[PDB]
Amino acid sequence: TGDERFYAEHLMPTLQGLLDPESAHRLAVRFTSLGLLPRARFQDSDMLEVRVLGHKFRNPVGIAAGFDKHGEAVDGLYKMGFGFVEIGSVTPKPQEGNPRPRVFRLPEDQAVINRYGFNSHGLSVVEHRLRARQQKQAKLTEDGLPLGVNLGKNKTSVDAAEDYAEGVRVLGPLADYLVVNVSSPNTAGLRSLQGKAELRRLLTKVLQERDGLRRVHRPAVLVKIAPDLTSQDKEDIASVVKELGIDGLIVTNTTVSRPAGLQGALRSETGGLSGKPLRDLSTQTIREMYALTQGRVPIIGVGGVSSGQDALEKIRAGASLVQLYTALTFWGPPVVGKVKRELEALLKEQGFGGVTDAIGADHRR
Ligand SMILES: Cc1cc2nc3c(=O)[nH]c(=O)nc-3n(C[C@H](O)[C@H](O)[C@H](O)COP(=O)(O)O)c2cc1C
Ligand SMILES: CC(C)=CCC1=C(O)C(=O)c2ccccc2C1=O
Ligand SMILES: O=C(O)c1cc(=O)[nH]c(=O)[nH]1
């Protein structure tokens, strides 16, 4: 389409030439929040509907955590055509995150490196922001546009499990699903919570807190994992998720690896790498986690999605839903309708009745 070409070829590269990435992010959130974007033209086909995690998703393309960290732009993100929105990560207390600069573009790689370090307005501010639109969200969710909330932990926390428990208590009642984010590369010791013993203790506490919420306020609980896990780590996570009845996995966060071939001048910056160089590392992690959970644990697939093909590869590997972030930063809002249009076309070409028929299809070949 003309908008896709205009944004991708002219407007976004021009604005990126003018603005440092964190300034660009802040202006993107402000513009989205104000609805200063035409309403998406693409009308969602019945082929794109997914029923998973106790909810209807009008389309399987979500905005990944970290774009709307503080729940400021939720309605603008639905207006952009996302089938679901995930906010956060949110930490219990407000915290500033790492010193600036902490976000870096790798244009030659269609990648970003970030070390934000969980900059967060904190649970109380986000709670009041979501409460201001709680019944609007109830109607959106009923109409197939669910809301996820991603929970983090404060830098100076002495008890990680209590940070996540506080998040469940405060934002669980406002969420369709919660994400226990134990895979940020930018908080010291956080990824150690993916270990078997630490994860079983942490997730038992999180599920007990969730189960204590009133039924209409009781969200699904997902664990978001790194792309950098050992085979042992992945087997341990699969075992714990099945043992405790965790509702789903988000696969994956950013990578601390630096794949051979990166060209960006900023490739050796500390932080998590996102975008195209992460794509197939994430797809293969989805594939492994689907097999280790016997296809019984819903997966939200994320990492380097910028086309219908990228989305369908993750769905065929075992994802019920996908998310994107970094593609939005390069191609702008038109990328959402592009992914959905291309995904519909490919499902038809490959003989799938809809997204649901394609979930895990590669494992049945
Ligand atoms: C600038 C930036 C900030 C992010 N912040 C968060 C976060 O707060 N919580 C989280 O779970 N993931 C966060 N992520 C990771 C994304 O949710 C996603 O897992 C990852 O970027 C891969 O998707 P992509 O290649 O489509 O960007 C962030 C990613 C980026 C690029
Ligand atoms: C061109 C404008 C105004 C916004 C696009 C954008 C980036 O360029 C960026 O680097 C970026 C980096 C991290 C998060 C979000 C973004 C983003 O939203
Ligand atoms: O630094 C952050 O806040 C952040 C970055 C990232 O890539 N992933 C995440 O979970 N948090």
Author numbering: 32 to 396
Give me lines lifted from the publication on this model:
Dihydroorotate dehydrogenase (DHODH) is a key enzyme in the pyrimidine biosynthesis pathway, essential for DNA and RNA syntheses in all organisms. Human DHODH (HsDHODH) belongs to class 2 DHODHs, which occur in the mitochondrial membrane and operate through a ping-pong reaction mechanism involving two distinct steps. In the first step, dihydroorotate (DHO) is oxidized to orotate (ORO) while flavin mononucleotide (FMN) is reduced. In HsDHODH, the second substrate is ubiquinone, which is reduced to ubiquinol.
